[PDB]
Every structure is written in structure tokens, then in C-alpha cells.
């Protein structure tokens, strides 16, 4: 499983969730940096590590951060 952490610089633009091809991220309301949305990563067991999320993050550098961790079948995109 990779480590996806999301920081308080998230302005809540939903782009990281729309880019995620594995449904790892979701947008949670107001229980984060501020009100008006925030992101979260509850399903990191399905993260492959493609970093489309932080490719789409528009903040300075990346509010969403993928830290490549231990691999598995779900974290290596294996259909076998």
C-alpha cells in the first residue's frame, strides 16, 4: 500500500479526485483545512501510485502527496 497524505493547502478544487483512476480520494466537507470542502484519501489500499492526483493538484507544489510504499496486487495494477 502506498501512502497518500493530503495537506491543508488544499483549496478543494476536486481535481485530484477527478484525476484518480482508482477511486482512492474523495472530497469531505469542512472537517479539514476549512469549510467549503477538503480532500481525503480513505481507500489508499487501492492506490497504485500513478500520481495523477498530484499531477492535477494546482496548489504550490502538491497538496496531495503520494509516497510510494509497499507493493501488492492492488498497488501494482495487476490483473493477474
Amino acid at each position: 500500500a502506498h501512502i497518500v497524505k493530503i495537506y491543508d493547502t488544499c483549496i478543494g478544487c476536486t481535481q485530484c479526485v477527478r484525476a484518480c483512476p482508482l477511486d482512492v480520494l474523495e472530497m469531505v466537507p469542512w472537517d479539514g483545512c476549512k469549510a467549503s470542502q477538503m480532500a481525503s484519501a480513505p481507500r489508499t489500499e487501492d492506490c497504485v501510485g500513478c500520481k495523477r492526483c498530484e499531477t492535477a493538484c494546482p496548489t504550490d507544489f502538491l497538496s496531495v502527496r503520494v509516497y510510494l510504499g509497499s507493493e501488492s496486487t492492488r498497488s501494482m495494477g495487476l490483473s493477474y
Binding site: 501512502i3 497518500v4 497524505k5 493530503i6 495537506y7 491543508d8 493547502t9 476536486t14 479526485v17 477527478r18 484518480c20 483512476p21 482508482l22 477511486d23 480520494l25 474523495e26 472530497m27 469531505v28 466537507p29 472537517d31 479539514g32 483545512c33 470542502q37 477538503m38 480532500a39 481525503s40 484519501a41 480513505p42 481507500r43 489508499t44 487501492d46 497504485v48 507544489f61 502538491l62 497538496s63 502527496r65 509516497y67 496486487t73 492492488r74 495494477g77 495487476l78 490483473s79 493477474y80
Partner: protein, 143 residues
Amino acid sequence: WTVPTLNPDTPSPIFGGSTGGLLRKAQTEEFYVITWEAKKEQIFEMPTGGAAIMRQGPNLLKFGKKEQCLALTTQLRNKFKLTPCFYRVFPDGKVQYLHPADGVYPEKVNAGRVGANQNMRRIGQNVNPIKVKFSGRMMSPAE
């Protein structure tokens, strides 16, 4: 909204057979099932390869990887404007619902889903790796 139970009586799209389908991972570890209710018969694009014809009404489709199911999900949502929902099926018969885990799609708020893996600091306010040294496993300062 409540968690939907997977209907096995749902038919499948008209596909002539490929080689990009299921492998021994389906029999051994897991596989995935995506469902959707269509309004017409439309030739869509399989993520495994080739084109299939969805049926008017409900459809069901097997996949060996979650990324395949979400690829078809975004294809059916963006090109056909449908609302699909997929699962995770285990070879012993256990079904685990996956995508709209709260009912609504994850880019939209739901007013009650809990924020996980949220570091409440700035990315430059992370500690140096000397402070997280000898924590057992090799650990990032983001923890």
C-alpha cells in the same frame, strides 16, 4: 441511500469475446463487477480491448482490476452520462461494494463522510527524516 446488493440476474453487454479478460487472479485473489442501467443499445469501448454493445436496461460486466472498472465508469459517465457502480467479488462469493461507497460520487460532498489521511500541516512543515529514524520500519516523515 443504502448499500446495494449485487444482482447476478443482470445480463451482460453483447461482446464477441476477447483475450484481455479474466485471468487466474479472478479465481485466486479477486475480481470486479461493474453494473449500470442503460437507456438504449450503444456500442461502447471495453477497457480490455474491443467494442461491446450495452443492452437496453441493466448491464453487468466482469473485470480483473479496479482500474478497468473505473475506466469504464468514467467512459460511461462522460460519454454516455450514466451512473454506474462497481463492486469487488471474491472467489468464495463475497461481494464488496467499491465506487459510490456513500451513494454519491467521490468528487461531490456527501455531508458525513469522514476525512482520512489528512495531514493538518503544510507540506514544508514536515519533520526531517532524522527525527523518524529507527521507528521500526522505514517510515516517511509524513507518517
